Amino acid sequence: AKKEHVPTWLQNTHVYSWPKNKKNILLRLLREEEFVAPPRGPLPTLQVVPL
Amino acid sequence: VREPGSQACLAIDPLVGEEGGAAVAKLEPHLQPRGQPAPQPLHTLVLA
């Protein structure tokens, strides 16, 4: 196949290639994100230093 | 002739408030260190 073969309305999503992206396809089917962000921390505490 | 005694010129000098002036302050954010056990992105792999 080639990029041109994808119907237009399907080009607005993730297009996997076979067998290149098989692991990514499995992740998509599992509905598990390949990267999961670390939990968001608290805003840093600002230290005031005179000059 | 006239004498400047009464009409003498005046010098001027401001009453500077620098002795009691506040200083300029620099801010530094206390970064949540990665040296401490900060979290990491969970890059996932699949065992097929």
Swiss-Prot record, chain A:
Summarizing the annotation, the consequence of altering T13I is:
In CANDF8; abolishes homotypic interactions with the SEFIR domain of IL17RA, IL17RB and IL17RC; does not affect homodimerization; does not affect SEFIR-independent interactions with other proteins
The record's tissue-specificity note reads:
Widely expressed.
According to the UniProt entry, the coiled-coil residues are: none
Q: What does this protein do?
A: E3 ubiquitin ligase that catalyzes 'Lys-63'-linked polyubiquitination of target protein, enhancing protein-protein interaction and cell signaling. Transfers ubiquitin from E2 ubiquitin-conjugating enzyme UBE2V1-UBE2N to substrate protein. Essential adapter molecule in IL17A-mediated signaling. Upon IL17A stimulation, interacts with IL17RA and IL17RC receptor chains through SEFIR domains and catalyzes 'Lys-63'-linked polyubiquitination of TRAF6, leading to TRAF6-mediated activation of NF-kappa-B and MAPkinase pathways.
Illness the protein is tied to: Psoriasis 13: A common, chronic inflammatory disease of the skin with multifactorial etiology. It is characterized by red, scaly plaques usually found on the scalp, elbows and knees. These lesions are caused by abnormal keratinocyte proliferation and infiltration of inflammatory cells into the dermis and epidermis. Candidiasis, familial, 8: A primary immunodeficiency disorder with altered immune responses and impaired clearance of fungal infections, selective against Candida. It is characterized by persistent and/or recurrent infections of the skin, nails and mucous membranes caused by organisms of the genus Candida, mainly Candida albicans.
Q: How does it assemble?
A: Interacts with IKBKG/NF-kappa B essential modulator, with CHUK/IKK-alpha and with IKBKB/IKK-beta. Interacts with TRAF6; this interaction is direct. Interacts with IL17RA and IL17RC. Interacts with IL17RB.
Q: What is this protein called?
A: E3 ubiquitin ligase TRAF3IP2
Q: Which organism is it from?
A: Homo sapiens (Human)
Shown residues in whole-protein numbering: 524 to 574 of 574
UniProtKB/Swiss-Prot annotation, chain B:
Post-translationally, this protein is described as follows, namely: Glycosylated.
How it assembles, according to the record, is:
Forms heterodimers with IL17RC; the heterodimer binds IL17A and IL17F homodimers as well as the heterodimer formed by IL17A and IL17F. Forms complexes with 2:1 binding stoichiometry: two receptor chains for one interleukin molecule. IL17A homodimer preferentially drives the formation of IL17RA-IL17RC heterodimeric receptor complex, whereas IL17F homodimer forms predominantly complexes with IL17RC homodimer.
Let me know which tissues express this protein, per UniProt: Widely expressed.
Residue range from the parent sequence? 624 to 671 of 866
Q: Which organism is it from?
A: Homo sapiens
Q: Tell me what disease the record lists for it.
A: Immunodeficiency 51: A primary immunodeficiency disorder with altered immune responses and impaired clearance of fungal infections, selective against Candida. It is characterized by persistent and/or recurrent infections of the skin, nails and mucous membranes caused by organisms of the genus Candida, mainly Candida albicans.
- Identify this protein by name: Interleukin-17 receptor A
UniProt lists the gene as: IL17RA
The task this protein performs is described as:
Receptor for IL17A and IL17F, major effector cytokines of innate and adaptive immune system involved in antimicrobial host defense and maintenance of tissue integrity. Receptor for IL17A. Receptor for IL17F. Binds to IL17A with higher affinity than to IL17F. Binds IL17A and IL17F homodimers as part of a heterodimeric complex with IL17RC. Also binds heterodimers formed by IL17A and IL17F as part of a heterodimeric complex with IL17RC. (Microbial infection) Receptor for SARS coronavirus-2/SARS-CoV-2 virus protein ORF8, leading to IL17 pathway activation and an increased secretion of pro-inflammatory factors through activating NF-kappa-B signaling pathway.
